[model samples]
Target chain A: SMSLQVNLLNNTFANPFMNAAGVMCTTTEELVAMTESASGSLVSKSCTPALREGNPTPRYQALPLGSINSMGLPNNGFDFYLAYAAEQHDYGKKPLFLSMSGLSMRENVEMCKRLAAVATEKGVILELNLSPQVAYDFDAMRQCLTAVSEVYPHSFGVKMPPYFDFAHFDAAAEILNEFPKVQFITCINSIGNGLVIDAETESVVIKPKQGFGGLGGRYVLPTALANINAFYRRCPGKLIFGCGGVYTGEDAFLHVLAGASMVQVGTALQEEGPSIFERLTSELLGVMAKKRYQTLDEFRGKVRTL
Target chain B: SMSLQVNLLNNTFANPFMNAAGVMCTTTEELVAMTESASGSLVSKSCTPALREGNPTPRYQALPLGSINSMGLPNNGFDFYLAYAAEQHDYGKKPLFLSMSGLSMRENVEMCKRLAAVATEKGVILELNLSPQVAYDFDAMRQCLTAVSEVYPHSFGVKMPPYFDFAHFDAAAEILNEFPKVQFITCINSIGNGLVIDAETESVVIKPKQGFGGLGGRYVLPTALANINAFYRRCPGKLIFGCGGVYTGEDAFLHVLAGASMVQVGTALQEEGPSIFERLTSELLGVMAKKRYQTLDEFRGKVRTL
Candidate 1:
């Protein structure tokens, strides 16, 4: 059998597919469901300092090509997820990722102290969301990492917003390269601030941020690939986890070709639930079989250009 | 009997829809074809200092979602387009636009000086394609415009590449707002540097930039609208002309609603030929009819957000 197993963060998983943070991972029940699914690894929903009700109604919508969401970081709070992570059992060797989007540095440090304990070497990896509160300020990211590293100077990862310009890609990569402990980089959280219209109603689809939200799914495939390859080309020291628009095996394959060590599902996972992972792995295996390849490394990051 | 007429730059056009600069406007014959079509106003193919063969073969490809091109500014050159614009007649009151992609400031000014005579207060408008060479340096654009305006001393416009970040949008707009002569701002050129893979061939599609090229068509609608609305919100002094992903009437309507005074078709026109304009205008009219709008002025830039 072809090996779909991936080695990253000094650990090996059965496959390279996993759940993007915040998709079908918010509640403990949902968390239990994904842990039982086919994903090689799974991330718990990103939690803030406290539980958040998030934005108003109609904050997310399914568009024709993709999805738009202004979920506003709705979560069950840090202690809730931390408590769940502390009691984890029988999850096998599959990696568990616990993510957080602390409202402030103080809040982030408090959680970092706690996350650093379990994150000491055994199981759960700490992943920072880098959400709206942090946004795109590189120095701010550096400062946040500086403070968090002081408390928990261990291996962790971050989920990043999509970077469109090469200048941005280069600059962001430069900052990331300085953080040796920021092990894996999950690129392309979403193509943010895209507007979707409902002509039938002559109104915006969602009811937050003036109907502007992050766009994901098919709409972001090209952008996701672009960002992934860009980060891959730049950040040699970091493992790249690809997200945005991985709706099928073909997309997952594209992510690997673009230099992602592992691929994560977001919008598709939200729509199809955890079961999509089984289909994705089988489809990926079939694709590899057709290409006569027995391993993921054979074609990973081997996309030929003109 | 709904009118699609639009007023801009102290002149009137038959409608607000027109051909985007580089598509179906390369040769004099194609220019003549668009002149006789339903386009309110039309523009010439962007020409360089001299005739350019552009990039190598297989430089462009039609993909599942849109199209990618690295034509390398293949054109009949500056003299050829200027010669065609010189003898223009019998084209009604419709405006003619002459666009250029100069290799350098010297070349731009050379054309700018000569372009000044007809652009003195008359039929033709000068538009600069802020293409690959200039790319995204706002200061460079400012310098180019400062020089060109000195020689031309007339109203002109620019076709800009898509700007994803608000900083870019604001910075570019700040530069644009500095130039009073730069009256029109085409919100998007294309979302550039996107890669399209042919899984069947397992090779890159186009033969330029390692198979990376500017992406246009249905894929760019949301981005196109975002850029249009962004510039509209930032550059109040300049008119916003929308392009990218405009394939049908609904697309055009969205463009207008996103604060475009005129909408231009590129990828769709290349696929459907000049006939697409007639269909686009009618569809736009029908959409307008359904909304009980008599003029574009009634609802343009009136998108309702939550």
Candidate 2:
């Protein structure tokens, strides 16, 4: 029997497929849909400190090969998400992952004060996204991790941007390796600040960031797997969760083969409906069935070099 | 009325198209074919101080979206290219570009001395490639350019690796801006050290760098355009030569629209025969036909931001 359960972060996920944080779960309707979906787990939007209206209109578009977006943290306040998560009588049995992203360290610390108290006693997990505002400062990152572990001794992870060079990979991997409590890493947030232009109109696509946003979807899948494998080999014991350009079961399989214990679907979740998860699981199982592999670990991180 | 001619580096070429330095022009037959090719100008391979055997076999493979390679700069020594260029009867009428790569500063300095003496008074142009080794050291880049300028003081451009961040783009652009004699810049060489894997075999495609090489063709085309536009905006008054992921006339038009004064064909030139340049030029003109434009400069660098 092939079970999709993934063991990581001192806990077990029913399967390795879940919608990425910040993928259409802010409203109660979307949140309810998420809980009732066939995905392995549920992830709330990366909650901001306060109510975020996000970027202006025409902030996202799907290109021929991929898509681009600059939806700037459109989400309800952390309190709203927390309030709903605390009373999840029906969804509580399923694993819950709450993603937190504060624009500044002060905001992060403020959010941590409340989350640290409630998070320690739930079946939930915490993931800090420093990929945007705080990726540049290693000193701030170290201090932030210390701040979290000091208050709440719970399993936590970090979401990061895709790194292009080995120097950067080693620099960030060694930094994360410093803390054993940093249980898992979700790498490759998105190739950020990418500008997509309409050749015919001679104009740039997205309105926010001066017509610049993040590159996502199909073209980014290989890059996502590369980053995941980079951390997987460098971090040794730390778990890796893959994000970026995963649209199919094959895409998810690529991430697992590269050493991602779990795969987070981003653009596909937005483009396709929640039913895509059911298709992904069935497709993944089909692959497993062909390979005659029982568990994901049978072939995980076994990519052979020529 | 629409000629593909481009004016750059205080000189003019028949058209704004040339094979990248390390294309298939190393052999005598390939060189002869290049002379008769439809490309705007003919160029030689990147000449090394000594003959290079290059990396092992299977170091290159064509992927579905793009291609990956770690050829390790295989060439037939600078002497052979120098001898060929010293007497170009059938090809001298075509603009000649010689690409020079040095394994170290010592090797670079050694080659620059010879090239400087003869290069001072020839139709041939000199290009220094510090991307492979010297990219890490900014100070050394300055020193290398200074070393070449002191001896030859000829019009030169540098072939550089693709830069990902605005910081890297600004840092390099500002450095190039300081050098008034530096006439043109080839914005991207390749996204280096990428790993491409075959899921079926569970093995890597390329053999060099332990399954790591450069990413090229379709997937990298946008990244290529971004880098071209990035340097086009940052490096005022300097010419931008676009490379990487150019296969079609539309691909060429995108680079020109992004402010590339000229385009260098790499992977496509390798995959297709030398006739690709003709197809590219014709295809480019066809788009120009549709846009109701006659000149490449009509909308070059005129990409409107939303």
Candidate 3:
């Protein structure tokens, strides 16, 4: 068992427990029961430039080992974060990490700066979520990282995916390494370009595009781990946040063992409901106790060697 | 572009296409309509030894990419097939491939042998679906295969997971190879072992005690292809059936190009209804024409190096 208490740069995230980008709701009231039960320190969902309708009906599907989703980042926008933070404040002060995204690089930076200021004012931390858009335009990631770092100097983490090349990793890492103020590195938001179909309709559901949406589940565990493993190897000593398809505490433990100081659960919650949080977390803690590992730090990345 | 004729070993299938196991009765008529309109060969719904009422209402949950189903293989039994074959046969003369299941090897072998004999008497070839149970109990698989094979030697084709280790593959290969009289193999059944929950009750929806049920969708494709690839590599000249999240002709084409003699559509059929066969086949042919590949073998494994 490793130390579960995560020491994020300037701010300590009580436990190394954080929600990844995209678990958003309008208010913390929507998540109090979940956070309370898990005692997770950080929480955030999709916070974008505007409140969008999200994806249409039939927005999610479950595969045997994982799931797929195309909820086009339906968000209440940055304005709602204040009220959301207030609601969460009422539920005992856990470090809330607001994940913010936008369509364009400029819009993303703008959202990042806005959320940073608002989160600080509201006593929340901000996770400058690099939107899935970056997955296509790898060219823009470095600049986006620089822009967000320039604006928000406080407690922040940049949500990124597995870097395709050393250039992308080096570029993003250079900025994060320079910005000691940046707290942690959250790897992966969602892998888009995955699709699902409605056999009954002879048409794609959710998005208007014929293609479906991003996929998640236990299927993504290996991918998420690979990303974290790469990040931990290249940028050692920095805190790592892992998200994608974490269904059980064993899943979370695997993420930790793969080098994620904290783990996030998404598709699992949607299909399994919020109780999955309790189930997973309890299972995680039990594994830790059984292994005689007292904290997250002890077990973090241990499996990477194996 | 591949000449996808629905010529199974013994019969010229009404269509060259069929839905994977797990056709829902609630959606059956609608599914049949789609299959008929598209000229699909056959359809098989999920099944069990006994008729189950299935999970309570709200059994279906929509996700962004895929849907979770707790519809516990609720069926009207062998009698339903007897009635349905007639109803559907009159409409299109499409031969039905009935999927069957049982708790014990004896039950499975007996049911399959009986079904095989009856289907043969009716002039329809039988697809003896050995599902996740075989994956769970290898001995049951061997015994069931031997008993059923001895009973209905030439009229059956056993479906199995697409990929397994060399040892497991050899074990299955040995048993299946012994039954050379049976038609070719259906590579890749659904990936079982997943868990989903109810939002309202906060309880698991399909508690199989084994955890989750078999998973299907696009997520299983690569693995299905891999399984087909492996079987194709080892079992030269053996016919291979392909399927797992095929929604379009492109997907279907890929399966054929991966070495499947014929590809079945599962999750896509479930989502798109029956018409998926037409839509996918059309798209497949279009892809074939575009690529200038006259036969599936022309492009089979073309992307393996890539």
Candidate 4:
């Protein structure tokens, strides 16, 4: 029988599908919808320590290839999501992952401490969301990881920006390798600062950062696969989660084949809404069936080279 | 009549098509073929201070979406290209640009000093190529730009790696902005560190860097467009040369429409040979005619927002 079940960190997911941290997870209502939906697991919106109104309106635009956004990490703060994690999570049904993107290093460490204290009891996974806006500061990144690992000391991971160079990937993997507690690595979070212009208006699309925003959707599928495969090979011990340019079952299949243990939907989920999860699951199973593989492990991380 | 002529740095190109630095320009014969081809301009291979044999064999591989290579800056050295610029270039037919990728900052400065000494008499454009392997060190970048500017106070530019964040784009632009003599900015090299695997073999693709290399072609079109547009808006004074994912005239059209004064071909040129220039020219003209655009300026840098 064809099955999509996946085991990660002593926990099992019905499938490898989930909403990316930032999309369709901003509110309790959205989170609840995801929980009741077909996804194997759900993640909370990447929240800051304090409530944020986020960037100005018209901050996101759907394009032919994918979508563009500069939401500026808008969320109801760490306490708000923590409350949901504590009260609303149902570990018996599906796993819940909490995401955090604090404005400062100190804030991130502070939030990690709180999560560490409660994560064990709540049975939740913690994901540290790193922003693309910050330049690659390996020293700072190491410090943050070290601080978080000391305070949390649990199965945690990071949501990383796509890295384009071998040296960067090597350097980043070295840092992550140092922390045995880090369990998963999300491959991408949109190619940031993409500008979409409406040809007729001759103006930029979206309002945040003067129409500059993170790019997602089909435009990013290849890069997404590339990053997923790069990390899967580089960080042999860590699980890889694929995010970016996933809109179809084929996309999900490709992600798994590229070495992602889990697949996340963003632009597609935003445009098509949560029902996309059911479609993706069926589509993925269909692909697996055609490939004559019952379980994902057969084809997972199996991208063939010519 | 539809025409693709573009004027940049007080010179006119018959069309906005050319091969990127690292592809068809690696040898003297290749350079000659490019000179005779329909490309508006031709740039020499990015050379180090001395000749380099480059990475191991199978370093370059062409794929359906695009291509990947860890050629490791293989070239015939700076003096070889400089000699070509000094003697072989014919200014009456097409402009020749010299590309330099010194292994170190001091070496880059040494090459720039030589170019500056003879550039006034030789009539060539200087392009300082930056590699993706090095992490983002803006201060170091600034120092390089400053050193080159001081020595080569002539029309020069840089071939930059693709940037994924607004802060990086802003920071990189600020550094470039400080150097008024920096005349143009090539939007991207390749999306670096992509890995390709063969499922059957269960081994990595490409021998160098353990199957890690820079990605190009369709995989990079969107990122290339984004980078081109980002800099077009960020550095208004500098001309832009688009390089990435251009196999057809339609791709060239998009680059110009995104504000590129010129476009460079890579994997496609490698696969199709030098004749791709004529096909691209014709294809681009066809698009301009359908759009009712007489010259590039009518639609250049004119992406519209909805």
- DockQ for candidate 1, C-alpha atoms: 0.45
**If you assessed candidate 4 against the hidden native complex, which CAPRI class would it receive?**
acceptable
Residues B147-259, candidate 4, lDDT per residue (tens digit)?
A: 77877769888998888776678888888888899889998898877665543354556888667688888777767888898888889999999999898877887788788
DockQ of 4: 0.37
Docking class of 2: acceptable
Model 1 residue runs over 4 Å out of place are A89-93, A102-113, A131-151, B89-93, B103-107, B131-138, B141-151
Q: What's the distance in Å from true for residue A71, model 1?
A: 2.0
Candidates in descending lDDT order: 4, 1, 2, 3
Specify the poorest-scoring 10-residue window by lDDT in model 4 chain A: A129-138
Give the docking tier of candidate 1: acceptable
TM-score of 4: 0.87
Better of 1 and 2 by TM-score: 2
Per-candidate count of clashing residue pairs (backbone under 3 Å): 1, 0, 46, 11
Please provide TM-scores computed only on chain A for all of the candidate models, following their numbering: 0.96, 0.95, 0.85, 0.98
**lDDT (Cα, tens digit) per residue for candidate 2, span B33-87:** 7778888776688878999989997987887777788888899998887766666
- The pairs that clash in candidate 2 are none
Task: Please provide, for model 4 over A1-306, each residue's C-alpha lDDT reduced to its tens digit, 9 standing for 90 to 100.
Answer: 988999998889999999999899989899988998899988999989988999888988898778889898889899999998888777777898999887778898899888876788877899888753432667877888887887886898788888776667788888889988889999788877766655445577787665668888876776787789878888999999999888877788878888999899999999988899899999988877776789989888877654
DockQ of all candidate complexes:
0.45, 0.48, 0.02, 0.37
The count of backbone overlaps in candidate 3 is 46
lDDT of 1 at A294: 88
Please give the RMSD to the true structure for each candidate, in Å: 2.7, 2.5, 16.6, 3.5
Tens-digit per-residue lDDT, A1-306, candidate 2:
998888875567777888888886778777778778888876788888898999997888888767778888899989987776776624544577888888877777788778876676665677888772465456777777777667656778888877766776777887888888788899778676666767677777878865667777876776787788888899987889888888877778878888888899888988886898899999888888887878999978877877
Best by lDDT: 4
Better of 2 and 4 by DockQ: 2
